[PDB]
Amino acid sequence: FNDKILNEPLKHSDFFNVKELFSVRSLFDARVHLGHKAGCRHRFMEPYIFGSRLDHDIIDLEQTATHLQLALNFTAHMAYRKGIILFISRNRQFSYLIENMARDCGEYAHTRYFRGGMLTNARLLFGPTVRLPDLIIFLHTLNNIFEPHVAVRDAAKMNIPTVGIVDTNCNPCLITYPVPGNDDSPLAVHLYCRLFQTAITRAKEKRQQVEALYRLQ
């Protein structure tokens, strides 16, 4: 029994202080607020959209912030609980960056062609005793077609919560902690990488500190 480390954080609220990493202004600067053309808008992102400035959809930044606070916090918590985080993408532009991010943290990445049953069949594609991701993050929930990346569905099937940065093409639906925002621009992506990376790092540090404290005690 050393289970005061896992529950105390749950009991507290924004205990990693993840909200501090960003503001609305920051998001604006990073061009998170931009979306696709109003014809390309998907039905299930209409509550999150503010309006459309000359047929170009603009996301509600307050809403995004609200969502972000949740999602990032969740991610941090997962990190703290020795949990496997898996970043996924299929934008190519940002594959390298994502890989780097994965490397820097203790976490992983899969920016390449997603084969049929990396999660549903895992038992065969790897050995029989695999630990699947305890969380998943999509920087880009679309594949290189404008169609929802297989992984969301797979994640759902496998009972794994998915965070996801969702633009005006995409279904949130199966995504647990969605974050409305700009997928297709670089600055936004960079910002996202920063923030998520920072959260995970904090979790890693914080947990270690806690452990040390308990040892001392």
């Binding site: 202004r25 604006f28 061009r31």
Partner: protein
């Protein structure tokens, strides 16, 4: 402290309005012999190509002047439930600086 709406109001993309024929400045960030990958702010990037006039000047990092012909390039086709985006802006090169 600012809102979001207020921020939107006093931001360059809303200050301009429609993008049709507006001389805009933007930097080039990637290169493959002929084509030039140009970021001009906004949602997407765009590509133009190296002209004959001072081709060895258009390097990675430099500023260039675009005419801008829409921001997104989309269209809906015969059987399409949604318009098919390119993820590019379509903006013609004027020159440098």
């Amino acid at each position: 402290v600012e809102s979001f709406a207020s921020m939107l109001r006093h931001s360059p993309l809303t200050q301009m309005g429609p993008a049709k024929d507006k001389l805009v400045i933007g930097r080039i960030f990637h290169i493959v012999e002929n084509d030039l990958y140009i970021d001009f702010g906004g949602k997407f990037h765009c590509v133009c190509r190296r002209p004959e006039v001072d081709g060895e000047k258009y390097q990675k990092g430099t500023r260039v002047r675009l005419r801008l012909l829409d921001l997104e390039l989309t269209s809906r086709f015969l059987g399409a439930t949604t318009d098919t985006t390119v993820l590019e802006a379509n903006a013609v090169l004027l020159g440098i600086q």
